[PDB]
Amino acid sequence: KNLRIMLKLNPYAKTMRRNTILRQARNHKLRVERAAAALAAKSD
């Protein structure tokens, strides 16, 4: 629960956590792209 104690013990968890946040904002942007390309597939 403490970011900088996790970086005091495991300095890699900083990039392990910057990933899976970028990767997640981009997978949620891919999903909202599919799901907003299909609202034009049942409208066209």
């Binding site: 996790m6 005091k8 013990l9 495991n10 300095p11 890699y12 968890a13 990039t15 392990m16």
Partner: protein, 225 residues
């Protein structure tokens, strides 16, 4: 003078500032290589089953090397043979937990003490939650909380275990210095199972709590740790 002794002491204070950057870089690229190890050992356990389902055969996964044992009974009314084994497993207290590598001589003890423990095969996330949150080291015969990597390096250093990540890797992937790494860890003291036990006095296959719940030890760890 003292202009010489000053710049000298500052050279010492700079070598001790570079010997730390070199070690944080080592710890970093170590954890970065354990991420790769765990990713491989995970993806290849799925390969080795898809290549058997393509041909029609079966892949029997390797029997697990590491177990996590939890004591689910009190100290009031224990046989002497079960009280000697619950103390060679260092489970001298209810809800204590420890890691145990499996073989014939170990399973045959987890069979003797079966009605008193609820052991199983820990996930990797469960060894993470355990080592990080409930991780204490038996330093100088003192239960010292693992707050910095210089508490692990100072004792397990001679085995090239110098960070909480080398410790997790040594526990998860049962290593050459497993006896020493697992014995450096003061046995974990876990709280009561949130939600609650099913039935403490009967085996897990009898719809209870005791015995071996191979995969399902992690569901208990999350509600106990």
């Amino acid at each position: 003078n003292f202009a010489e002794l000053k710049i000298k002491r500052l050279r010492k204070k700079f070598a001790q500032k570079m010997l730390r950057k070199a070690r944080r870089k080592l710890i970093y690229e170590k954890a970065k290589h354990y991420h790769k190890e765990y990713r491989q050992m995970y993806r290849t356990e799925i390969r080795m089953a898809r290549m058997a389902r393509k041909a029609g055969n079966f892949y029997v996964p390797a029997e697990p090397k590491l177990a996590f044992v939890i004591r689910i009974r009190g100290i009031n009314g224990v046989s002497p043979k079960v009280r000697k084994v619950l103390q060679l497993l260092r489970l001298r207290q209810i809800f204590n937990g420890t890691f145990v590598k499996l073989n014939k001589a170990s399973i045959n003890m987890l069979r003797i003490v079966e009605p008193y423990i609820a052991w199983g095969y820990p996930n990797l996330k469960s060894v993470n939650e355990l080592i990080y949150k409930r991780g204490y080291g038996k330093i100088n015969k003192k239960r010292i909380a693992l707050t910095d990597n210089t508490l692990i390096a100072r004792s397990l250093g001679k085995y090239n275990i110098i960070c909480m990540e080398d410790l997790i890797h040594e526990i998860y992937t049962v290593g050459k210095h497993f006896k020493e790494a697992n014995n450096f860890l003061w046995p974990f003291k876990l709280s009561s199972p949130r939600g609650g036990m099913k039935k403490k006095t009967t085996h897990f296959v009898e719809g209870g709590d005791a015995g071996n719940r191979e995969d399902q030890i992690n569901r208990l760890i999350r509600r106990m740790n």
